[PDB]
Design an enzyme around this catalytic site. Structure first.
Site, PDB file in Angstrom:
ATOM      1  N   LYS A  45       0.830  -1.199   0.000  1.00  0.00           N
ATOM      2  CA  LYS A  45       0.000   0.000   0.000  1.00  0.00           C
ATOM      3  C   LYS A  45       0.867   1.253   0.000  1.00  0.00           C
ATOM      4  CE  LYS A  45      -3.738   2.455   0.400  1.00  0.00           C
ATOM      5  NZ  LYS A  45      -4.403   2.960  -0.835  1.00  0.00           N
ATOM      6  N   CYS A 128      -1.731  10.305  -7.122  1.00  0.00           N
ATOM      7  CA  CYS A 128      -2.892   9.946  -6.373  1.00  0.00           C
ATOM      8  C   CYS A 128      -3.998  10.835  -5.853  1.00  0.00           C
ATOM      9  CB  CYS A 128      -2.466   9.260  -5.039  1.00  0.00           C
ATOM     10  SG  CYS A 128      -3.872   9.314  -3.840  1.00  0.00           S
TER      11      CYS A 128
HETATM   12  C1  LIG Z   1      -9.270   0.542  -3.472  1.00  0.00           C
HETATM   13  C2  LIG Z   1      -8.104   1.018  -4.278  1.00  0.00           C
HETATM   14  C3  LIG Z   1      -6.974   1.509  -3.636  1.00  0.00           C
HETATM   15  C4  LIG Z   1      -5.884   1.957  -4.378  1.00  0.00           C
HETATM   16  N1  LIG Z   1      -4.772   2.439  -3.727  1.00  0.00           N
HETATM   17  C5  LIG Z   1      -3.687   2.879  -4.456  1.00  0.00           C
HETATM   18  C6  LIG Z   1      -2.555   3.363  -3.797  1.00  0.00           C
HETATM   19  O1  LIG Z   1      -2.506   3.406  -2.568  1.00  0.00           O
HETATM   20  N2  LIG Z   1      -1.478   3.803  -4.533  1.00  0.00           N
HETATM   21  C7  LIG Z   1      -1.513   3.762  -5.908  1.00  0.00           C
HETATM   22  O2  LIG Z   1      -0.536   4.160  -6.540  1.00  0.00           O
HETATM   23  N3  LIG Z   1      -2.627   3.282  -6.567  1.00  0.00           N
HETATM   24  C8  LIG Z   1      -3.718   2.840  -5.846  1.00  0.00           C
HETATM   25  N4  LIG Z   1      -4.836   2.348  -6.496  1.00  0.00           N
HETATM   26  C9  LIG Z   1      -4.885   2.309  -7.997  1.00  0.00           C
HETATM   27  C10 LIG Z   1      -4.434   0.963  -8.552  1.00  0.00           C
HETATM   28  O3  LIG Z   1      -3.092   0.770  -8.143  1.00  0.00           O
HETATM   29  C11 LIG Z   1      -4.543   0.952 -10.070  1.00  0.00           C
HETATM   30  O4  LIG Z   1      -3.708   1.982 -10.554  1.00  0.00           O
HETATM   31  C12 LIG Z   1      -5.965   1.255 -10.557  1.00  0.00           C
HETATM   32  O5  LIG Z   1      -6.915   0.638  -9.724  1.00  0.00           O
HETATM   33  C13 LIG Z   1      -6.239   0.779 -11.981  1.00  0.00           C
HETATM   34  O6  LIG Z   1      -6.074  -0.617 -12.059  1.00  0.00           O
HETATM   35  P1  LIG Z   1      -7.347  -1.592 -12.235  1.00  0.00           P
HETATM   36  O7  LIG Z   1      -8.076  -1.212 -13.511  1.00  0.00           O
HETATM   37  O8  LIG Z   1      -6.853  -3.010 -12.377  1.00  0.00           O
HETATM   38  O9  LIG Z   1      -8.194  -1.468 -10.994  1.00  0.00           O
HETATM   39  C14 LIG Z   1      -5.924   1.909  -5.762  1.00  0.00           C
HETATM   40  C15 LIG Z   1      -7.053   1.414  -6.405  1.00  0.00           C
HETATM   41  C16 LIG Z   1      -8.144   0.972  -5.674  1.00  0.00           C
HETATM   42  C17 LIG Z   1      -9.352   0.451  -6.391  1.00  0.00           C
END
Ligand SMILES: Cc1cc2nc3c(=O)[nH]c(=O)nc-3n(C[C@H](O)[C@H](O)[C@H](O)COP(=O)(O)O)c2cc1C
Ligand SMILES: Cc1cc2nc3c(=O)[nH]c(=O)nc-3n(C[C@H](O)[C@H](O)[C@H](O)COP(=O)(O)O)c2cc1C
Lengths: 309, 313
Positions: A45, A128
């Site tokens: 995280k 972010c």
């Molecule tokens: C619940 C949640 C928490 C996330 N937390 C972070 C984070 O702490 N740091 C980060 O760089 N990306 C975070 N992301 C983004 C994911 O790393 C990823 O970039 C984004 O969800 C797109 O990928 P996906 O289409 O497979 O969900 C988070 C996404 C979700 C859904």
């Protein structure tokens, strides 16, 4: 015969799959579940120096929206790197997202000896998208350059950056021009969630997440064409760097397209949140099936070979 | 006793629905079919001072959840759409919008000067496209706030009437605030259309391992379901920050429920692009019936009863 192996950053990854930062990676128990899975790697995280309201996540028909904000603090994840992660199992990435260049730089000085002793790899989150008051650092190129220079001065090892999506070639060019001036940035992760979407529920006529008046980051099927574009755009403009693909992966065929676009590793967020760590057994099998049907024996045979027309 | 009527811009619209610019609106036959449909309005293809053939094909592709296109503003030329506005359109049927997309502020201002007398006599309404995401070399004007202010000042000097602007999507509040602060300084900007396509996505075919459209290495604007949450966010972001302007919603509309959410987020009119490309003009009969059914189940009698009333839990 055939292999999903990826030899990058001085490591042999068993396959290109890992979790996306923020998904299945905040508790000791989730990290263990990830380490125990068949994924090629895992990432923590995004943490802050010290340790948003709910609901902060929401499953959509086509993906997800989130306004998470929450971490056990840098010391916890640094400790997990120090003497709690089983490196003989798979390499480990740590995501950091301090609120200033100084916080990030301080955290990196601390990480430097752990990285050198244990092999943990830094991913710096510049994107972010739920940080109240602070727009995506990488949407301000002067701030981008200041973060990257600060980290490069404070951190001796190579590291990666997690980027927000861009939507036109001028921004792709400007971002790549900055990244290409920092030799220690060895990988670029494309993409973080598409920022500040808005989901409304028909029955209640209300937003579905509480913080920021319902605005949150989109993941899942919504973001797949945007994620491929960003992977390919940076693959083309940063040939000295690795690209990690993130966004919209549900199947081995999705992973195949990310690799075709240029991805070295492939991160799985929304689909992993829904499926749990067993998804990785399915993704590797599906990836291998696509490759078999095409006669590919290794990822290096088609990574980045998308044909223009 | 329920009504989908919209009273804005000095007109009564029978309902909020119209085509999105560029879809079903390039030729006289398409404009006539839009006029004969049950849409509350219609808009022409974004035009340039001269006719253009546009980008080489294939330049449009149907995706599982929407579409990708790199049309490149193929259009019959401003003189064609001006003549349609002046002499062919049946204004007793419904109001008409004309979309213009010159390649410079001076191109746009010259076109507005000629449109002005037609707008005064016939009532056609101007939509200025600042967001077109496929013009090789020329990036989305509204992604450069200095050019945006320059275009708006140029058109405000050249054109005497209220007009609207078609906006690209934004993805952070700093950009929402910057754009709204500029827009609020131009009293003649009376409506804002959110959004144009999400620019420069990329689709690759698994079987052929190649991009699905030819221009710009396969990169193109996304429409359809991919863009719905982004479109709603942009509609609501500008609804909140530009209270003196109308917001038109565009993006992701396939059902009456999708349109209900646009209106709830603040949309006065609701444009339909990809879905209309696929279904044709009979979609408007279905969308009005579905939207009326959503309102019947909730007790709403008019759109003013819930427009902009999204509840922030
Ligand atoms: C619940 C949640 C928490 C996330 N937390 C972070 C984070 O702490 N740091 C980060 O760089 N990306 C975070 N992301 C983004 C994911 O790393 C990823 O970039 C984004 O969800 C797109 O990928 P996906 O289409 O497979 O969900 C988070 C996404 C979700 C859904
Ligand atoms: C084939 C095609 C042509 C388009 N042409 C224009 C155009 O000329 N001017 C413009 O402002 N938008 C144009 N658009 C964008 C649409 O007006 C609309 O903003 C976008 O498709 C999102 O709406 P949708 O999800 O309903 O498709 C075009 C879109 C498509 C798919």
């Amino acid at each position: 015969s055939m292999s999903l192996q990826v030899g990058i950053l001085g490591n042999t990854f068993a396959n290109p799959f890992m979790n996306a930062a923020g998904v299945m990676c905040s508790t000791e128990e989730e990290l263990a579940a990830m380490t125990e899975s068949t994924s090629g790697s895992l990432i923590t995280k995004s943490c802050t120096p010290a340790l948003n309201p709910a609901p902060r996540y929401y499953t959509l028909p086509l993906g997800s929206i989130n306004s998470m904000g929450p971490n056990k603090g840098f010391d916890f994840y640094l400790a997990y790197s120090a003497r709690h992660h089983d490196y003989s199992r798979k390499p480990l990435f740590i995501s950091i997202s301090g609120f200033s260049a100084e916080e990030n730089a301080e955290m990196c000085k601390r990480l430097a000896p752990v990285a050198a002793e244990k092999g943990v790899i830094l991913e710096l989150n510049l994107s972010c998208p739920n940080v109240p008051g602070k727009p995506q650092v990488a949407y301000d190129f002067d701030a981008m350059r200041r973060y990257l220079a600060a980290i490069s001065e404070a951190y001796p090892h190579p590291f990666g950056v997690k980027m927000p999506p861009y939507f036109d070639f001028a921004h792709f060019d400007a971002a790549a021009e900055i990244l290409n001036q920092f030799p220690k940035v060895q990988f670029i992760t494309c993409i973080n969630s598409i920022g500040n979407g808005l989901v409304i529920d028909v029955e209640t006529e209300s937003v579905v997440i509480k913080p920021k008046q319902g605005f949150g980051g989109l993941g899942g099927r919504y973001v797949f064409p945007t994620a491929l574009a960003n992977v390919n755009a940076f693959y083309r403009r940063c040939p000295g760097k690795l690209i990690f693909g993130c966004g919209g992966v549900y199947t081995g065929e999705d992973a195949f397209l990310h690799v075709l676009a240029g991805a070295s590793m492939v991160q799985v967020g929304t689909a992993l949140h829904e499926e749990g760590a067993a998804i990785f057994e399915r993704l590797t099998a599906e990836l291998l099936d696509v490759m078999a049907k095409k006669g590919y024996k290794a990822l290096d045979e088609f990574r980045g070979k998308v044909k223009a027309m």
